[PDB]
Symmetry: C3
Subunit: 278 residues, 3 copies
Amino acid sequence: AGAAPAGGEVRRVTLYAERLAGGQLGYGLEKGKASIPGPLIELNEGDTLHVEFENTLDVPVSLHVHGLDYEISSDGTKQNKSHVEPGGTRTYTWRTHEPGRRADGTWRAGSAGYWHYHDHVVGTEHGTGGIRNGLYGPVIVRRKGDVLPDATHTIVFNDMTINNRPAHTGPNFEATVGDRVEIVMITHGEYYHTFHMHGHRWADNRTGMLTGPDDPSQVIDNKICGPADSFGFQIIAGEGVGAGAWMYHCHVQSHSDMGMVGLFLVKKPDGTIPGYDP
Amino acid sequence: AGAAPAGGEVRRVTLYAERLAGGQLGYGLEKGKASIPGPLIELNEGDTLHVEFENTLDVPVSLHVHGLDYEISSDGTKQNKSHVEPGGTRTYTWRTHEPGRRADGTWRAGSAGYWHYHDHVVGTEHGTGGIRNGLYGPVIVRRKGDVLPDATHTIVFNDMTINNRPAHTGPNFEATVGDRVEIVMITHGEYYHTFHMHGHRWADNRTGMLTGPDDPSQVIDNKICGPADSFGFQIIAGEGVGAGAWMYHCHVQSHSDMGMVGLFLVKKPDGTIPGYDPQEH
Amino acid sequence: GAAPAGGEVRRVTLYAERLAGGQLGYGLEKGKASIPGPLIELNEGDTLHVEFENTLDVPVSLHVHGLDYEISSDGTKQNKSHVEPGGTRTYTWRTHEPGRRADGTWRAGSAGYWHYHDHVVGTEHGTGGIRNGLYGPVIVRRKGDVLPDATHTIVFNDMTINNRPAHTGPNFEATVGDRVEIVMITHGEYYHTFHMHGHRWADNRTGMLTGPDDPSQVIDNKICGPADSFGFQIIAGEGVGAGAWMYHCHVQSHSDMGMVGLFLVKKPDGTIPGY
Ligand SMILES: [Cu+2]
Ligand SMILES: [Cu+2]
Ligand SMILES: [Cu+2]
Ligand SMILES: [Cu+2]
Ligand SMILES: [Cu+2]
Ligand SMILES: [Cu+2]
């Protein structure tokens, strides 16, 4: 299993806010390439990221990040004049640090974790309209030595939608039996939810996997989440269970009935899925 | 009351889905003995359990389990043709595994924990109708060496009820001061809840007991929980607090007001509970 | 510095009184009830006798989370430990250190972030009391726990913070470098998500990792429901510098309707950039 290296170099990215089909709004790495969720940003602890951001909408937009260090000027709020006028640009700077023993003997928590970014000014001064229309995306900050996945998939419970999609339209994610699959799970909007995965489980801790025999973290397959919660994990696809179309869904009963459901399609090495209809 | 043995046996059990009185639906180990919650299934990591399931109802029913290992054919979903027709029988197979180091050097989590089973197919294709009406039950998978309890009690916040009971009708559970009591706590339905126990606290971790002095898990007496959450803990009945009628309730204020309350009745060795008058409760 | 080993028998007087316009509160002296009520701080092993007095015209009580108490200090009508109007009562709370039981398992100590509230005003679960402000924080410290420069209590009570009007904070001040303690309690009817701009904490007992072996998730956003309590300590402006740092419920209509405040972090000269 490939691991993350130590971090600490300055990076840059260009990010644009654009209007998408049906009045949805999204972030993209290039003009014309916006998505919901936004592009996945991956940093190692210690790295810095200057985000060259341009607003192409007819309303102000901003960029607010969870978990990472940033000055008040990268708050992404109107109150710290951190928002971007229509047609305007701005460079947001995010930083990350490693953990270590402080001067006072206490242990400073590193930046590592599953985080996210989103608008803070569309609709209201807390980004309610921005978030609803799709201005959010994931951010992973890794620790030196963190196991790397074969693939990462972002699942956002945005009010009563998954990734702003129409009810009962997934998304579905494919893997092969044995694949190390990373899930980033973010919630937004007004409602609480409970994320459930069939056939798989993870540890309720930073990485989603137990550090070893001495980790007392609960092993779960179901987790309550509220607006702006983020967590993540890695699983071995089909480990001890085999290939199949493995449901994931919100477990709030009316939410699953109304379409907060998707499929984690785990294929056999020949690419087929036993007992499934494609 | 001892320690869990290392698992590994092939077990078999017979499980039935049945109509109870008042339009409720339950699982039981024998016809005429269905209950809400269903029977407590208990396993040691490594055990294989073949659930010989019989659906005596006149609509399809299923059995979906959390946490344990199953092949997709024991998904218990219509979507994977794992439901049981009216009057039919089907063998569901659940497996469990010990933790251990993988070839890539990572640590694989074991099956141990507080889990549950429930219907996935009555009323809707997520079992909303079957869950609402009582088709759920607890599963405990023990890690080798886990401390065994003197008693285990299952408390299910199902919608606005506890174990599908009428408002303000318990259940109540009895212990003696010093008894090691295990609580399995499961939530189902539409609503978030907060589970609170007067006079007692636990660790927010796999077993509900701190591993030792190095375990940083929060110690709590109030825990938010949502549909399909399961957790558990073991407490020493009356430890440091004595005998009494110790309330457990949902702490969402209108929920307690409208019936989501019960009693942990902890008795002295002589079997008394001083001051306890059920007319005051 | 750091918290000592506990074991004092301490006492405190507590009054329940009416405040302006329907509000009810606990106070250390009459005419000085606050919302939330006064902070109570103890060391594991400490015993506390609360000499309580009810100045209200209806029964009131005092129920506490987490601490040891015998049944007679439950603070419930059901078990006959409520206080009649104009009455008095002594409620006793005990705390204990961690240690190994006779049966060989580890008994969790009392240390943690806790709270106390009414259990009999309005309903026999204190629904009317909690609604109007009868709640307060309790911290029980473990020997060696690091002590903070300041402690601030934030209660999400239904759609208010600390029963204050919408969009009125509260706001709290600090200096860059300060070790700041937050106590976060929830009451009432709604779930919430507590968010802090510019800072993070560990989701464990103290809010800070014990060392490098601590696998607790590090977070800046936490879901909470009625009667949940937690707390943490942060070094103000650590790696982020000074400014008006927002905290709020992240449920979107809740922030929009005014569950917001400012963690005002001043530079050593006492000024806040952008403010
Ligand atoms: Cu949901
Ligand atoms: Cu946010
Ligand atoms: Cu409830
Ligand atoms: Cu389920
Ligand atoms: Cu809120
Ligand atoms: Cu309470």
